[PDB]
Design an enzyme around this catalytic site. Structure first.
Site, PDB file in Angstrom:
ATOM      1  N   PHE A 107       6.162  -3.808   8.174  1.00 37.99           N
ATOM      2  CA  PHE A 107       7.118  -2.914   7.544  1.00 37.99           C
ATOM      3  C   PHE A 107       8.479  -3.586   7.520  1.00 37.99           C
ATOM      4  O   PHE A 107       8.744  -4.530   8.267  1.00 37.99           O
ATOM      5  CB  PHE A 107       7.221  -1.577   8.280  1.00 37.99           C
ATOM      6  CG  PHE A 107       6.027  -0.700   8.109  1.00 37.99           C
ATOM      7  CD1 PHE A 107       5.956   0.189   7.057  1.00 37.99           C
ATOM      8  CD2 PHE A 107       4.978  -0.760   9.005  1.00 37.99           C
ATOM      9  CE1 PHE A 107       4.857   1.000   6.898  1.00 37.99           C
ATOM     10  CE2 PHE A 107       3.874   0.040   8.851  1.00 37.99           C
ATOM     11  CZ  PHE A 107       3.812   0.924   7.798  1.00 37.99           C
ATOM     12  N   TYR A 155      -2.926   2.258  13.389  1.00 38.35           N
ATOM     13  CA  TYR A 155      -4.184   2.971  13.183  1.00 38.35           C
ATOM     14  C   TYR A 155      -5.418   2.210  13.663  1.00 38.35           C
ATOM     15  O   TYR A 155      -6.491   2.817  13.739  1.00 38.35           O
ATOM     16  CB  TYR A 155      -4.399   3.274  11.697  1.00 38.35           C
ATOM     17  CG  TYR A 155      -3.314   4.061  10.999  1.00 38.35           C
ATOM     18  CD1 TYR A 155      -3.351   5.442  10.963  1.00 38.35           C
ATOM     19  CD2 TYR A 155      -2.279   3.419  10.339  1.00 38.35           C
ATOM     20  CE1 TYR A 155      -2.371   6.163  10.313  1.00 38.35           C
ATOM     21  CE2 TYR A 155      -1.296   4.131   9.688  1.00 38.35           C
ATOM     22  CZ  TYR A 155      -1.350   5.501   9.673  1.00 38.35           C
ATOM     23  OH  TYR A 155      -0.369   6.214   9.026  1.00 38.35           O
ATOM     24  N   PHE A 180       0.811  -1.215   0.000  1.00 34.35           N
ATOM     25  CA  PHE A 180       0.000   0.000   0.000  1.00 34.35           C
ATOM     26  C   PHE A 180       0.847   1.269   0.000  1.00 34.35           C
ATOM     27  O   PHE A 180       0.383   2.312  -0.472  1.00 34.35           O
ATOM     28  CB  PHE A 180      -0.957  -0.001   1.195  1.00 34.35           C
ATOM     29  CG  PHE A 180      -0.280  -0.050   2.535  1.00 34.35           C
ATOM     30  CD1 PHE A 180       0.080  -1.257   3.105  1.00 34.35           C
ATOM     31  CD2 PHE A 180      -0.017   1.111   3.231  1.00 34.35           C
ATOM     32  CE1 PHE A 180       0.689  -1.301   4.331  1.00 34.35           C
ATOM     33  CE2 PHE A 180       0.598   1.072   4.456  1.00 34.35           C
ATOM     34  CZ  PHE A 180       0.952  -0.135   5.005  1.00 34.35           C
ATOM     35  N   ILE A 187       3.930   6.895  13.390  1.00 40.60           N
ATOM     36  CA  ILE A 187       3.122   5.960  14.157  1.00 40.60           C
ATOM     37  C   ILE A 187       4.004   5.329  15.226  1.00 40.60           C
ATOM     38  O   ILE A 187       5.231   5.237  15.079  1.00 40.60           O
ATOM     39  CB  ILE A 187       2.477   4.899  13.239  1.00 40.60           C
ATOM     40  CG1 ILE A 187       1.844   5.535  11.977  1.00 40.60           C
ATOM     41  CG2 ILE A 187       1.424   4.072  14.003  1.00 40.60           C
ATOM     42  CD1 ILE A 187       0.947   6.740  12.234  1.00 40.60           C
TER      43      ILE A 187
END
Lengths: 49, 48, 107
Positions: free
Chosen positions: C99, C82, C36, C56
């Site tokens: 990640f 999130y 994404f 984040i």
């Protein structure tokens, strides 16, 4: 639901012509050994991996 | 399917990797430089 | 909170320190999903300074638990990430994020 797009690199492979297999007794006792060498890193050529 | 082993990394330069196979019992076992990896395969058809 | 699976090459001693820039080359990936976001395709290092609390929590937490040069496979939980409603229009609700980071950061 909808379609997706992304760039993607090749994946390709080659073989030695070294055939074996478990026959009905002429299997050549099923025992061979591999060996590989690499002299590079190149973790990210352009985009992906 | 990651496998725990010492010296975990990708295929770094100047490394040795190998394998061994047995046609009697299906047993595909791998090994790397220094020590073997903690993972094998077994129980598969071998009709080819 | 964060469970990295590092990769060997790099320094492995120079940890990040507070209030300094941290170059990355993050490439996002959704859990049992698709890419994404990524910076390698965009060709930009994405500089950011730790301490200001803008990125984040999971990403900075994973960056805290590593050092220069080493690649890693960061994982993040929905509460850390999130996942209460989700980032609108891209991430769904109750997400679990992945990640992996490489860097040539100054300190």
């Amino acid at each position: 639901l909808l379609l997706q797009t992304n760039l993607i690199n090749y994946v390709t492979s080659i073989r030695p012509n070294i055939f074996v297999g478990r026959a009905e007794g002429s299997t050549q006792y099923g025992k061979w050994y591999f060996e590989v060498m690499v002299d590079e890193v190149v973790p990210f050529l352009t985009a992906q991996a | 399917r990651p496998v725990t082993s010492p010296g975990q990394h990708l295929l770094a330069p100047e490394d040795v990797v190998s394998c061994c196979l047995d046609l009697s019992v299906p047993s595909i076992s791998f090994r790397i430089n220094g020590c073997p990896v903690q993972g094998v395969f077994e129980a598969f058809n071998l009709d080819g | 909170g964060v469970e990295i699976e590092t990769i060997s090459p790099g320094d492995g001693r120079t940890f990040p320190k507070k209030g300094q820039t941290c170059v990355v080359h993050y490439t996002g990936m959704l859990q049992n999903g698709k890419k994404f976001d990524s910076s390698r395709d965009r060709n930009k290092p994405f500089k950011f300074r730790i301490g200001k609390q803008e990125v984040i929590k999971g990403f900075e937490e994973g960056a805290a638990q590593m050092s220069l040069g080493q690649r890693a496979k960061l994982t993040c939980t929905p509460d850390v990430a999130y996942g209460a409603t989700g980032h609108p229009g891209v991430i769904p609700p109750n997400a679990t994020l992945i990640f992996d980071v490489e860097l040539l950061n100054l300190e």
